Amino acid sequence: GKIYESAIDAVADVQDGAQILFGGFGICGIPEKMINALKQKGVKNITGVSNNGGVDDTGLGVLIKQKQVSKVIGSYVGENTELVRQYLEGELAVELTPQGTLAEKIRAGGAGIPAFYTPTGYATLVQEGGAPIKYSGKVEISSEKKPVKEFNGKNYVMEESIFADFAFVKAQKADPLGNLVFNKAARNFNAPMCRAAKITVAEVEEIVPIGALSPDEIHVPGIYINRIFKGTNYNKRVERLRITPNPAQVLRERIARRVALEFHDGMYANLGIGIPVLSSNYIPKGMNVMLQSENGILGLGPFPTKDKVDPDLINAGKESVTVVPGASYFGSDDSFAMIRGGHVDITILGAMEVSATGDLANWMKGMGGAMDLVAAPGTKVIITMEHNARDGSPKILDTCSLPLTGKGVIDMIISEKAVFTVEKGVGLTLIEVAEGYTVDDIIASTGAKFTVSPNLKKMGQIPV
Amino acid sequence: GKIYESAIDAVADVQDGAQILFGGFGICGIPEKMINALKQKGVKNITGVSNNGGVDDTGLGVLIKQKQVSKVIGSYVGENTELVRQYLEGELAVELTPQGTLAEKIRAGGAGIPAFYTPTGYATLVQEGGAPIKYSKDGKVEISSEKKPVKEFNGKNYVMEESIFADFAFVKAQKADPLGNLVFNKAARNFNAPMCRAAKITVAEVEEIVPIGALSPDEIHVPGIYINRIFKGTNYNKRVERLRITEPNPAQVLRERIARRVALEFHDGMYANLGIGIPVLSSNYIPKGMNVMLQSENGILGLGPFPTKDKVDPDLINAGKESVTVVPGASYFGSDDSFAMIRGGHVDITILGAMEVSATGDLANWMVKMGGAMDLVAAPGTKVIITMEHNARDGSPKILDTCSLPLTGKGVIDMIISEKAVFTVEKGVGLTLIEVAEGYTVDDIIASTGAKFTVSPNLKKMGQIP
């Protein structure tokens, strides 16, 4: 470690063309003060490794606004329109990477592991290449094909590590040796990022004396960190405020009241935003379901009351959230290990399209968590979606028209009309139908052929 | 996961032929009670993944003594002679793995990464294969290690290694809450950290069970999701294997000269790893108050001096298994994190002993594997200094043209410091004599020393720190 009274001194040796890691998930745990220091310095032609692009003119967005970034490696850049604007106009390269692969690429880079194998991305544009990175139409740079290799009968994509010139990272406290401690879900990518650069800069809200961070409570050992800055007027906001009639409601609730039935005591689940989250609200009183969030939380609770809103505590959809007793916080690399390693029992997500053989498409915006979640071994994948697209317009097809998130990946599809089970790679089976619908309406709103279960029934609904 | 008041209930579904991870470094942080439960259960034909074999009848040794283990994957198994006895007799398979590669294999397995590349082992038996894993009772090598694939990235060479993901993991910690969130105490973490994430079923034994909430969310070391079953043991036989105390000699005299020369290589702000023996000795001569943070591969940054008699803690030891202390600002972490730190290049300098050393920078120990050594010397942008006695009394050189022994690393060393001489190495090309101790001449150094070398036209007297 070493303490700097001035941020601009801290970035003084940052060269044009530098690869720079930036911590943060959304606007949570972002290195605000060092980003302004870099803005003030006017360094150009940065490859910014960041999970997101902040939003317009916040986080990494501050630097994109000033055209200081020539490429972005990340997983989801939707929320920054200026960034998309530059991508399309051909002013800016964008390499999208599944969020868990991004985390491991960084963790591996800092651990001196130049490449590794992951199941995430297999049979998708990630493995196949061809996705557009840079326009000048014309597509000037598109993604290279990746080597694949099979272990224990499953297929994996080879991925190369990331190790940057600088890492700009945010935390809660430092001691002058550089030992760091993070607060809540603001950890996210800062955890792995601070280990994967030649020079690491940590901004923090408090500097404590040597000793004050006990040895069994330190999250990042000081050896990983070169420079330390204490910022003091942090503009911490929540991006999607959430605090604790009607037919489209009641459809969403039916769907949720159906997935709720898939919960059992002791279960670990990941719920995507929208419908999957809604289903947490219907977990029977006594039953213990620990909900995992890919931004680095185990034990997600309901939205906070007005007085408990914390910008350092959000879910994967950037909503202010709480945690239940027994919650734990961890880094983005640890979060996706949990997942890629198969430790999460069940995953519930939305989709744009779904196929007869279990295919999922819902990133072509960006892919983020979805690819990793559905690629995970021994993990039940349930899709929750509106059966049709408004003009509906089937969403359940024979083959997807869109780029895949995963191939032969889904286990169960639950719409407001119907419940299917999937024999991955083979086909659908209608097993339940909501009251008031008939199998003829389902045949008519479904592009995919399917076999109707002998002994189908009415769609179940959890109590209360 | 869930509390068991009975250990035997906790291992009830462990069948014969199971692959089982066992936490612990040496006898520090071992799963003593579950190991006895397994002993009591009499499960057979275990592949035990453990860093060490404990010692005779402790830790994993309890199970080898009762012939319950048909294979051991680990990094260093000297210390358990029964275990070696069985290896030689052909009763037991042993796959040695560099300690850092073991840690990452396990971390990668639990993270669902089936394989990865590391520089550790390259150009050694680890990469080359051919090492005997299993003898038959006549034998006669029944199983020997496969050659490993190699691949180059950014101009450097790496060995491909496959992950480990086990049936069961038996792990030791300090506290649990009933959701399975865990907290470890000091250096007893070591392999328990990565192990508890890399098995279908994990069993954690702990010394205290606290209520849900008592382990705050930002202090938990292992989230409960990794852990299926929880047991509170209560009469732990925690020992230190090599007791060392500070209480307020002839070979030692040349050891101090050597140390007083390496001490000169320390600068304020530096991060170093010191092997046991001479390298450690050199810490004692660090100018106060130059700030040197010493890393220990068992999961510590901030190693201090041996504790006073009244401060000995079995949960706090160095890589050589000696009871130790830590300085203010120390941090503790898992064995996976420790070797990331190293393999990733984050340690500035490494100082080690050696049996032999070569002209081109090659290093040999053995006779996988002690440390620590392969990982340390394979690390990028890391200064490697060897500290050794220059020769054997009969004038047997230890600095050769080529090593006779199996290598720990190739073209790996930067500086060699004996009691007679200091060399710098241009890795892959040759030696350069740059200092000579008082009283010796270049002709002496030529005469001891098997290796050709170029004499620095600019050589001097060997320095010695105050």
From Swiss-Prot, chain A:
Record pathway: Ketone metabolism; succinyl-CoA degradation; acetoacetyl-CoA from succinyl-CoA: step 1/1
GO cellular component terms, A-Z: mitochondrion
Molecular function terms from GO: succinyl-CoA:3-oxo-acid CoA-transferase activity
Pfam family, one: CoA_trans
Compartments in which it is found: Mitochondrion
NCBIfam families recorded: pcaI_scoA_fam, pcaJ_scoB_fam
Name this protein carries in UniProt: Succinyl-CoA:3-ketoacid-coenzyme A transferase, mitochondrial
The species this protein was found in: Drosophila melanogaster
